[PDB]
Design a binder for this molecule. Structure first.
Ligand code: NDP
Length: 317
């Protein structure tokens, strides 16, 4: 009943992550046990681990805790009352979201409501890299009601959510403006960005010629606040980081502009859709580095720089 898993005993720097022997998750009669093949990293992982996030509030008196929500793998055990999944099925989805992060591990417990069948053409690494980043990109674009003709500014275009959002926005027929390092300019142009603003070189507002219909703000804080000034009268900002969502919405209200937060929800139909695109080479998931669980500290140090292009992923098997 043992497995290897990454845990942390205290909130702190990346060094607090440990590869630990731990029991296999318990599963209820309506849940399943999954042998994990792949699990991707998201910033929420390091914000929880350093204790800054809202999820850290709930785990405060409940450590040690695992980490990770995105996973890919094989169904090994099934509860008595699970009807539509079979043992041996290859699956992809989210586990333990939000209060029981657990995917940096060899086995996870999951509900059939938070997984789908992995398409055959998808690799396990691709399948584990998609759920959080992809569902967020899509639901942000939908919250902004992006249509063909619209101008869309996507901050942090080279990252996990961004690089997908750019591709999805291009496929919607929108003019895509984005912010990134000079180093990522060529990468983002190739994915469909019309303009890549080097945000180190000048105020990004100065680089934007005309009022924008939507801002997909993936940085938040003062960048999100600043983005309000480039919106059209009818434009809206979707500020995705949760910690400054309220602040950004308030300043938008004061500027008489529409603003939204975003809380990623699991959607079977959307993830089916995103996965199909990836299998048909119509949407690229950029996996910039593949780690073993043994390298979790290193992985988290890289992720916390805030300069990861695309996705980092653990190959568990
Ligand atoms: N509320 C929700 O349901 C969700 C919220 N999120 C949140 O959204 C945010 C982004 O997520 P994710 O895409 O995974 O993050 P990433 O770590 O993958 O994003 C890294 C990217 O950010 C860019 N970047 C860093 N600083 C700036 C800046 N000041 N201006 C413009 N770009 C910048 C970098 O570009 P470069 O190297 O070129 O400088 C890099 O490519 C996170 O804070 C995350 O917690 C994510 C998923 C769901």
């Amino acid at each position: 009943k043992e497995m290897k898993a990454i845990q942390f005993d205290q909130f702190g720097p990346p060094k607090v992550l440990k590869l630990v022997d731990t029991p296999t998750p318990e599963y209820r009669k309506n849940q399943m046990l999954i042998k994990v093949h792949a699990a991707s990293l998201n910033p929420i992982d390091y914000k929880t681990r350093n204790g800054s996030g809202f999820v850290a509030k709930k785990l405060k008196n409940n450590l040690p805790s695992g980490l990770g929500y995105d996973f890919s793998g094989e169904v090994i055990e099934l509860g008595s009352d699970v009807n539509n999944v079979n043992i041996g099925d290859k699956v992809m989805g989210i586990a333990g979201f939000p209060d029981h992060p657990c995917c940096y591990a060899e086995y996870v417990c999951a509900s059939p409501d938070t997984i789908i069948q992995k398409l055959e053409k998808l690799s396990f690494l691709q399948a584990a890299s998609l759920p959080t980043a992809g569902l967020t990109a899509l639901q942000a674009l939908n919250q902004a009601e992006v249509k063909q003709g619209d101008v869309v500014l996507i901050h942090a275009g080279a990252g996990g959510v961004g690089h997908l959002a750019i591709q999805l926005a291009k496929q919607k027929g929108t003019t895509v403006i984005t912010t990134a390092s000079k180093r990522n300019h060529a990468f983002l142009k190739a994915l469909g960005a019309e303009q890549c603003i080097n945000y180190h070189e000048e105020d990004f507002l100065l680089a934007i010629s005309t009022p924008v219909d939507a801002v997909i703000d993936l940085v938040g804080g003062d960048v999100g606040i600043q983005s309000i000034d480039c919106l059209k009268e009818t434009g809206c900002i979707v500020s995705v980081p949760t910690i400054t969502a309220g602040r950004v919405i308030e300043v938008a209200k004061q500027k008489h502009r529409r603003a939204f937060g975003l809380l990623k929800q699991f959607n079977i139909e959307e993830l089916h859709y995103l996965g199909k695109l990836v299998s048909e080479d119509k949407l690229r998931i950029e996996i910039s580095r593949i780690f073993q669980l043994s390298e979790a500290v290193t992985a988290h140090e890289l992720l916390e720089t805030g300069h990861v292009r695309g996705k980092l992923v653990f190959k568990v098997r």
